[PDB]
Design a protein around this nucleic acid. Structure first.
Ligand SMILES: O=C(O)CNC(=O)C(=O)O
Ligand SMILES: [Mn+2]
Length: 376
DNA sequence: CGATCCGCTACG
DNA sequence: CGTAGCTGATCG
């Protein structure tokens, strides 16, 4: 699977770039590999290297462990129960480093670690190169302007109507938009709701070989490769495990339904993640994501033509500047996060996990990494 | 109990 | 695309 070898090389080269920034010995990339063959990607790796190098120098600590926090949470605790969330806010407060009457919105790259150094949240503003943002802009635009596509049809079909908060009508930007608002999710293999005691199969959005879902995957391999390499700098065990899981699902036809389609999708899946969701022109209320493993680190990428983006993390007493090209890695099942409506058009690519694909592939799901792992 | 959960299936 | 069916665990 050359796609996975490509993202492995991107991850390894990004690690060498970062190491070289930290030691003062500039890394000299010499191999005739996929990074030499994709200079746009190489340059974007350099830009990410500089942002990650800054984030590692700016670590706030909370006075509790992720372990205790996750023990207190119930399996589907997403933030909608105010009494429970008051219990969490009192039991697990921001601490002295973060509490502050009226703190300023953050702009420098940074991270939040727990009392035993596990990374909970990694903030990478201006991480994605303009060239790759243009590529993503075009891929999302193609998806969100398709005349009879999911977003347009789902728009019109429920514009006759003018619980499931992720597609709630009032969260979508109203009026004329270049990009029809909506949500589409993609996965090489996953389970139907309430149906996990069976083999996973391809997401319905990706099953047509020439439908728009597969075409969207085809437009973004350079971006997915960048995102995967960033993940590898933050939690290398999780990156390597995700890649191993995809290789196993590719190799063993007994693990999925419709394995031939799963294999053709994996061949264009340039990512370590289990799943990718595209959220177009939608505000995001404060929430936790409950369907993945709490040990899983999700990655958010935000884009578009807007200028006042803010990502809110109330448990950290922080607001973060969240403008196009910003990347946020976070334990989304622990960390409450939200993104208010913005004055312009926006999309988000959210990368996340399905733990039982790890079980099915015989690959342990690793516990969240510590910051010192960056310096080994 | 009913409602909910980043959903698939066969049909129209 | 939508609709109804289907699953099992959580949550109120
Ligand atoms: O909208 C954003 O930028 C962030 N999105 C999410 O956290 C989500 O949809 O789960
Ligand atoms: Mn989320």
């Amino acid at each position: 699977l050359p796609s996975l070898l490509l993202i492995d090389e991107a991850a390894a080269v990004l690690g060498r770039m970062i190491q070289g920034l930290r030691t003062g010995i500039p890394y000299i990339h010499t191999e005739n590999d996929s990074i030499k063959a994709n200079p746009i990607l190489r340059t974007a790796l350099w830009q990410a290297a500089y942002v990650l190098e800054k984030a590692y120098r700016r670590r706030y600590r909370v006075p509790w462990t992720a372990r205790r926090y996750m023990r207190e949470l119930t399996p589907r605790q997403d933030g909608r129960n105010a009494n429970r969330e008051a219990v969490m806010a009192k039991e697990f407060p921001p601490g002295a480093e973060l509490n502050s009457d009226h703190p300023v919105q953050e702009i420098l790259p940074a991270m939040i670690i727990d009392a035993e150094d596990h990374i909970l949240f990694c903030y990478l503003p201006s991480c994605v190169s303009p060239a790759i943002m243009t590529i993503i802009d075009a891929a999302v635009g193609t998806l969100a302007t398709t005349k009879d596509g999911h977003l347009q049809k789902k728009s019109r079909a429920r514009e006759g109507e003018r619980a499931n908060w992720r597609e709630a009508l009032d969260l979508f930007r109203q009026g004329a938009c270049k990009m029809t608002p909506g949500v589409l999710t993609f996965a090489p293999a996953w389970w139907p709701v309430g149906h996990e005691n069976q083999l996973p199969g391809p997401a319905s959005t990706l099953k047509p070989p020439k439908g728009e879902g597969r075409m969207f995957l085809s437009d973004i391999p350079i971006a997915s490769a960048l995102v995967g390499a960033i993940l590898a700098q933050i939690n290398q065990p999780l990156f390597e495990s995700g890649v191993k899981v995809l290789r196993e699902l590719y190799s063993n036809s007994k693990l999925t339904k419709d394995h031939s389609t799963v294999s053709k999708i994996i061949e264009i899946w340039f990512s370590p993640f289990s799943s990718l969701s595209l959220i177009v022109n939608r505000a995001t209320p404060i929430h936790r994501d409950t369907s993945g493993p709490i040990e899983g680190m999700d990655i958010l990428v935000t884009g578009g033509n807007y200028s006042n983006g803010v990502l809110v993390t109330p448990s950290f007493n922080r607001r973060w500047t969240y403008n196009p090209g910003c990347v946020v890695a976070l334990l989304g099942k622990l960390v409450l996060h939200g993104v208010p409506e913005v004055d312009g058009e926006r999309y988000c690519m959210a990368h996340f996990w399905r733990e039982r694909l790890f079980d099915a592939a015989g690959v342990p799901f690793p516990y969240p990494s510590k910051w010192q792992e960056s310096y080994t």
